[PDB]
Amino acid sequence: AKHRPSVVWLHNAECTGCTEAAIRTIKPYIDALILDTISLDYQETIMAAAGEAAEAALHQALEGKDGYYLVVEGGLPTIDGGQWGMVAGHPMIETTKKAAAKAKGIICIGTCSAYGGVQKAKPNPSQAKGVSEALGVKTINIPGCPPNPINFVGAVVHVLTKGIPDLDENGRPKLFYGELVHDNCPRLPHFEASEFAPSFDSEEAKKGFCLYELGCKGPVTYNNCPKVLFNQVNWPVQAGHPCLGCSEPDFWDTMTPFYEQG
Amino acid sequence: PTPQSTFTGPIVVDPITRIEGHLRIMVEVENGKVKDAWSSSQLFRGLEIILKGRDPRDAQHFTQRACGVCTYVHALASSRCVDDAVKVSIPANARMMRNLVMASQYLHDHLVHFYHLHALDWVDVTAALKADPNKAAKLAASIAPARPGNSAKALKAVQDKLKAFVESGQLGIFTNAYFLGGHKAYYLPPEVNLIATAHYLEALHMQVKAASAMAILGGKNPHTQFTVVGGCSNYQGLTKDPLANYLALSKEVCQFVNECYIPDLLAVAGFYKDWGGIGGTSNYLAFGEFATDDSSPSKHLATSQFPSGVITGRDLGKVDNVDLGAIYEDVKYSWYAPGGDGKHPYDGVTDPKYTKLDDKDHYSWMKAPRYKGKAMEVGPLARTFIAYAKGQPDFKKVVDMVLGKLSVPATALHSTLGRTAARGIETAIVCANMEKWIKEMADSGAKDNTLCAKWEMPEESKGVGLADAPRGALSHWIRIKGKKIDNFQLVVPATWNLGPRGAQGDKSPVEEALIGTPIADPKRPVEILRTVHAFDPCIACGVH
Ligand code: SF4
Ligand code: SF4
Ligand code: FCO
Ligand code: F3S
Ligand SMILES: [O-][O-]
Ligand SMILES: [Fe+2]
Ligand SMILES: [Mg+2]
Ligand SMILES: [Mg+2]
Ligand code: NI
């Protein structure tokens, strides 16, 4: 019985798309990961225990002799003493702060935990913040809405087996976020030739012309989408739609309107 | 009989795990049965507020992040809603593509719910270790189609895997499970626990395939990126090889639905036949899905292949048409400012106002949607009763198969068991329709690849987008003023099912359904979970 590193996974202000993304991993599949590689010790979406039994499981993990890594999905809503987001009668900010204090490392899965995400968009009625801001500690950020499981699982595995990966200015592993979406886009030759679709119904769009005039944020977005694809089959631009810039901090506000460059 | 304690007092379950989002359930129990209940949603994000003043074209990208479990469905409802507001009729190919992506989402969503969210309420995973794999293989041959995954050797390999895991002392997601040490409310023989556990593991792999299928048309999953105002952007999705791969993957997924999902569902239903007498409600609503005409909300309601309708007081002889003007939302028992009761979504208000935990006057972030003053259950069971009542041939056939297998009357479906069964029933039906739907779009796409219609942004308009998402009747409602979002309101299946009391003090469907719940062990109240999970809760959807 080789001991498997303990992982505590918290859900704050989130849509669960990051959990869903993670379980699309195929190298390895999620069962192999949690049976052979990690000990996934708290995960609200799939854990058997509920209520006090679940809360007890969290505290058991947090007190584990061997320590644990923390994964955080979701931003933290801070208005009104953090009471607009609660689990087990405790503000999410309180529980996340507690879990983070003794974590071996903190991985923020998704743009929400990394940077604040959709609920932080203007006018931010819940006063949501990203984890690093809310806790005042450095986080390994795996952004995207959601990130590719290749990027999340690769980060987790890197962290448990190699150390902390080199991170960019925004906390993202350069292994996955070092290149612009645009620099790897198959439509780049059209961009270079000023061959842009003026609308989705246009013949230009049928011919696979560049989507920049239709708001594509590829040129300013760091991600590996066209290189690794999603679900082993596709990515947004391949499906004829501009990139929203979803791995960029505060993209809800910096990359909108989505169908324009203005 | 059904195990039941003598317990009298309160039980709170927070967090409700194995759902999307953050739910607290409070009940009062008397002599081992629930006598009162509160469904208290514990997170607010405020997407409707965030949307104000923004580009209507942006709405679908914000609202899709209402939820990543029912990914896509909000992008779809928003896209339908803006299409309606700008008065554009999408090309036939766009209707077909949008509807197939919805079908792929049903398949993925329902498989994951049954196995990874719901099954642990009925299946004691640790008891699988007690099973003899040979006896288990024999039993499997007697409850399900022949398959190599159900052989003694395959089931032994699963058992050996589970044994090594449990013996490691690191139980992970099974830590403190309600079934540890045995539980009077868990009925399954060890052999059935082993069979279901093997399938649970298989389903973790098969869901990846269901998502791959969906992403061929959707761009990616989660969070698709192929819809635009006026139709779809994905010209490649109309082409031969992608569609052949889409078909091939969908067939694998559907083989698993038919080989594992439905058979496990039926075995669980047979062992837990008493759950046909627990957790019923009376009113059902659906906007319908899989329409042949999506030119308007009216046409969607009328031509949905999974029909729309309203059933009241379990009367299957009187399916009414949906009156979209009769929907409104109350906030009397919700964490919103005073003055917001009785609002049709076009006039919706979202003014958050928290009080305190377990304030019986204000106890949820969900609004309370009502229909002419009545609560309405939405989702697979609502769709199933409506279709059955209307004599929809596929539902009639499959419902009757299930009723004949379990030897129960259709009235037994007004229950937590029925709610669970309905989810499988409709999954089998989607599966049976995939090839026909794929061929329709393949042929249409080959003849003419029109996928997006021209449209014009009006200065001022309003519109509504309807869908029946995996969890039920979803609607998005926009008011446009100065070509910008003046109001955007989501009314979501979870809101209908799990919201709090309405302005009359009337319980929501989940609160009503919880009344009468037996509690065998107050320390480990799995029966509360059985009913709540059967509604397939999504709190991020519900509150947005
Ligand atoms: S990053 Fe996106 S997909 Fe992940 S929880 Fe936030 S809204 Fe959902
Ligand atoms: S479609 Fe987007 S990422 Fe691709 S070449 Fe054009 S601007 Fe760049
Ligand atoms: N299905 C689903 Fe999600 C909920 N409730 C939506 O819409
Ligand atoms: S929207 Fe996001 S998923 Fe990739 S293509 Fe753009 S970064
Ligand atoms: O999930 O809605
Ligand atoms: Fe709403
Ligand atoms: Mg439409
Ligand atoms: Mg224990
Ligand atoms: Ni949802």
Domain boundaries, chain B: 1-544
Contacts for B314-322: CB closer than 8 Å, 24+ residues apart: B314/B282, B314/B411, B314/B414, B316/B385, B316/B388, B316/B389, B316/B410, B317/B389, B319/B386, B319/B389, B319/B390, B322/B285, B322/B286, B322/B287
**Closest approach of A201 to chain B, Cα-based (Å):** 5
C-beta atoms surrounding B144 within 10 Å: 21
A228 touches chain B (CB under 8 A): no
Which ligand is closest in space to the CA of residue B171? Answer: 8
Q: Take residue B223 and report the two structure tokens written for it.
A: 């969070």
CATH class of A1-176: alpha beta
Smallest CA separation from ligand 4 atom 6, residue? A243
B103 CA distance to ligand 6 middle (Å): 24
DSSP H helices, B219-336, are 240-256, 262-271, 297-303
- CA nearest A224: which of A168, A184, A258? A184
Read off the tokens for A191: 């961009």
Q: Which residues of B196-220 are buried (b: 16+ CB within 10 A; e: fewer)?
A: bbbbbbbbbebbbbbbbbbbbbbbb
Cβ within 8 Å, pair A77-B179: no
β-bridge pairing A68-73 and A106-109 = parallel
Q: Pseudo-torsion of CA A13, A18, A23, A29, nearest 10°?
A: -130
Pocket residues: Cβ below 6 A from ligand 2: A 181-182, 185, 187-188, 191, 210-212, 216, 218-219, 237, 243
Long-range contacts of B430-433 (CB under 8 A, 24+ apart): B430/B103, B430/B106, B430/B107, B431/B107, B431/B253, B431/B254, B431/B257, B431/B258, B432/B394, B433/B103, B433/B290, B433/B305, B433/B394
Which chain A residues have a beta carbon less than 8 Å from that of B57? 257-259
Q: Please give the angle made by the CA atoms of A25, B202 and A18, to the nearest 5 degrees.
A: 30
Interface of A with B in 115-154 (CB under 8 A): 117-119, 121-126, 128, 145-146
Spatial CA neighbour of B227 closest among B105, B98, B89, B102: B98
Determine phi and psi for A14, rounding to 5 degrees.
-145, 170
CA of A30 to the centre of ligand 8 (A): 23
Beta-carbon contacts of B397 under 8 Å, excluding residues fewer than 6 positions away, are none
Q: State whether residue B412 is helix, strand or coil.
A: helix
Q: Whose CA is nearest to atom 4 of ligand 4?
A: A225
Closest CA to B120 of B264, B270, B279: B264
Residues 6+ apart with CB under 8 A from B389: B309, B311, B316, B317, B319
Question: What is the b/e burial string over B292-319, where b = at least 16 CB atoms within 10 angstroms of the residue's CB?
Answer: eebbbbeebbbbbbbbbbbbbeeeeeeb
CB–CB of B8/B511 below 8 Å?
no
With CA atoms as reference, report the closest residue to B202 among B140, B247, B132.
B140
Give the ligand 4 atom nearest the CA of A230. Answer: 3
Count of residues for chain A? Answer: 262
d(CA B522, CA B525): 5
> Which A residues in the span 38-57 are in contact with B, Cβ-Cβ below 8 Å?
39-51, 53-57
3-state secondary structure of B80: helix
How far is the C-alpha of B125 from the C-alpha of B188, rounded, in Å?
Answer: 10
Neighbour count for residue B41 (Cβ, 10 Å): 26
Atom of ligand 1 nearest to the CA of B223: 3
Rounded alpha-carbon distances, angstroms, from residue B142 to B127, B271, B329, B406, B481: 20, 14, 49, 15, 62
How many Cα atoms occupy the beta-carbon half-sphere of B367 within 13 Å? 31
> A115, A141 in Cβ contact below 8 A?
yes
From the list A44, A40, A39, A106, the residue with the least C-alpha distance to A69 is: A106
Give the DSSP H/E element, type plus range, for residue A187: none
Domain-by-domain residue ranges, chain A? 1-176, 177-261
Peptide bond into B338 cis (omega under 30): no
**CATH number, span A177-261:** 4.10.480.10
**Count of Cβ atoms closer than 10 Å to residue B394 Cβ:** 17
Distance from C-alpha of B477 to C-alpha of B466, rounded to nearest angstrom = 9
Question: Which residues face B490 on adjacent strands?
Answer: B476
Beta bridge partners of B469: B472
Q: Cis bond leading into A257, ω under 30°?
A: yes
Task: Please tell me whether residue B532 adopts helix, strand or coil conformation.
Answer: helix
Q: How far is the CA of B442 from the centre of ligand 7 (A)?
A: 20
What are the residue ranges of helices labelled H in A136-243? 149-161, 174-177, 188-192, 203-206, 225-228
**φ and ψ of B501, to 5 deg:** -65, 150
Total count of residues recorded for chain B: 544
Write the residue in A16, A121, A199 that is nearest to B67 by C-beta: A16
Q: Are strands B309-311 and B284-286 parallel, antiparallel or unpaired?
A: antiparallel
**Pocket mutation for ligand 2, best pick of A179, A187, A195, A260 (most atoms within 8 Å of C-beta):** A187
Q: Retrieve residue B369's tokens.
A: 């949607």
Neighbours of B177 (CB within 10 A): 23
Give A3's DSSP letter: P
Classify strands B231-232 and B227-228 as parallel, antiparallel or unpaired: antiparallel
CATH number of the structural domain B1-544: 1.10.645.10
Rounded to whole angstroms, the Cα distance separating B74 from B475 reads 9
- State how far the alpha carbon of B143 is from the alpha carbons of A55, B119, B259, in Å: 37, 17, 10
- Residue B64, token pair as written in the block: 């899709």
Q: Is the CB of A73 under 6 A from ligand 1?
A: yes
CA separation for the pair B382, B304 (Å, rounded): 14
The single residue listed with the structure tokens 């923390």 is A70
Task: For residues B368 and B328, give the distance between their C-alpha atoms in angstroms, rounded to a whole number.
Answer: 8
User: Which of B154-175 are b and which e, b meaning 16 or more Cβ less than 10 Å from the residue's Cβ?
Assistant: bbbebbebbeebbeeebbbbbb
Ligand 9 centroid – CA B70 distance (Å): 4
Q: Which ligand is nearest to the CA of A242?
A: 2
- On whether A108 is known to bind a ligand per the annotation, the reply is no
Residue A200: phi and psi, rounded to 5, are -75, -20
Q: Which residues of B325-356 are buried (b: 16+ CB within 10 A; e: fewer)?
A: eebbbbbbbbbbeeebbebebbebbbebebee
Residue pair B216/B101 in contact by the 8 Å Cβ criterion: no
User: Residue B468 belongs to what H/E stretch?
Assistant: strand B460-469
